């Protein structure tokens, strides 16, 4: 019983770090565009 | 088609979980029968005598 009960409750080391990695890139990936939106529309002064 | 490519893989996940209900079932059931079958062979030897 104690075999049965622990294939639905635990965790699975080996998969979720690759998971971790993906989401810390794509954080990192978003605040840099983020930035970039940001500065975007600057150069209407120019034309004044 | 990606969409469809995302229910296939999402029905395959909660397969492998059934599968392997199925087969701590059998486990089960096996480990039950393995003492009947001593206490048969114990109930015997004391007949022969």
């Known amino acids: 019983l104690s075999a049965s009960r622990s294939r639905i409750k635990d965790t699975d080391f080996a998969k ?14 978003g ?15 120019s034309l004044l | ?4 490519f995302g229910t296939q893989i999402r029905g395959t996940d909660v397969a492998i ?3 392997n209900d199925g087969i701590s079932l059998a486990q089960v059931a096996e ?3 393995t003492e009947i079958g001593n ?7 004391l007949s022969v005598q």
């Open chain 2, 1 to 4: 088609i990606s969409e469809r």
């Open chain 2, 17 to 19: 979980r059934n599968a």
């Open chain 1, 16 to 29: 979720e770090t690759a998971e971790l990695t993906r989401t810390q890139i794509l954080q990192q990936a």
């Open chain 2, 31 to 33: 480990g039950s029968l």
């Open chain 1, 31 to 45: 605040t840099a565009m983020l930035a970039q939106a940001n500065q975007v529309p600057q150069g209407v002064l």
């Open chain 2, 39 to 45: 206490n048969l062979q114990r109930v015997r030897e």
